[PDB]
Amino acid sequence: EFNPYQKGPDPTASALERNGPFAIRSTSVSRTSVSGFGGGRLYYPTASGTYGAIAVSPGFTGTSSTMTFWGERLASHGFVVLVIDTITLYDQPDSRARQLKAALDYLATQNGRSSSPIYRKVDTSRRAVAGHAMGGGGSLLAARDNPSYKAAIPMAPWNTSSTAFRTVSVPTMIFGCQDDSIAPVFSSAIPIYNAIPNSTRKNYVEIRNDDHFCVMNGGGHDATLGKLGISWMKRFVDNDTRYSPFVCGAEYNRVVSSYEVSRSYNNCPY
Ligand SMILES: *[C@@H]1O[C@H](CO)[C@@H](O)[C@H](O)[C@H]1NC(C)=O
């Protein structure tokens, strides 16, 4: 099927386990130069063309410096990625959802500014969210409230009641940390997964024998979580069905049946 959003080589496991084939630059977004979020860190490919836009939120008392992995790893596979700082360290999930929307609106603005390093670099119609803990809840609430979004990746989601997510229509991949002692997977992440309609493309992958920061910088799951996140963004932000096997096929089965993973659920195939 013709796909104008397809970029980069045919994917193989080893390639998706490391920084991608797009050379990237990063720049700081000053809190003072934006409204509706606390600024953050911008990653973009230096090669020409338009790329999907992704906004990533930290959790409670979290800063963008703790998620630079996701900025670099996603951008280097061919996305424009803004890891936000929030207005306050203490912003709740609903607030983080509004800030993720403003962050994506910010990218759409900068796309039309001749001065911006991402001038003419953003496909403003192809937007996704992701986040850690209350940022994960926030990404899923932003997906609920903005059903034009292409993908959400909540990671170790925290407080928000599962009942909030019974109408989510955005393709959602959730990461769990099996021994999360802040947001226990069986009471926080898995009920959220289960609440999403079975008509929505979804996936849950849980990291074995690890706690709440297993998805964050220094978490020690770059190869697996990076591969799954790149693959989910590629599949849904870019409509790139070459990535299906990494979320539903042979390469997914090898990962979820490995010693690194304690659970997976999905409504594959897709
Ligand atoms: C949910 O969707 C999946 C994939 O389409 C399907 O295989 C499965 O049987 C569905 N579950 C229920 C309860 O219908």
Residue numbers in the entry: 23 to 292
Q: What's the paper's own text on this?
A:
Substituting His/Phe with Ser/Ile should expand the substrate-binding pocket to accommodate the bulkier substrate PET, and the strategy termed “double mutation (DM)” has proven to be useful to enhance PET hydrolytic activity of several IsPETase-like enzymes. Here, we report our experience in establishing the P. pastoris strain that expresses a PET hydrolytic enzyme from Caldimonas taiwanensis termed CtPL-DM that was identified from sequence mining from GenBank and modified by the DM strategy. In contrast to the protein expressed in Escherichia coli, CtPL-DM expressed in P. pastoris is inactive in PET degradation. Structural analysis indicates that a putative N-glycosylation site N181 could restrain the conformational change of a substrate-binding Trp and hamper the enzyme action.
We obtained the apo-form crystal structures of wild type and inactive variant S155A of CtPL-DM, which adopt the canonical α/β-hydrolase fold and are highly identical to the structure of IsPETase (Cα RMSD 0.477 Å and 0.471 Å). The TPA-binding W180 adopts the C-type conformation in the CtPL-DM structure and an alternative type in CtPL-DM-S155A. Nonetheless, W180 in F235L-S155A, which carries N181A mutation, shall be able to wobble freely.
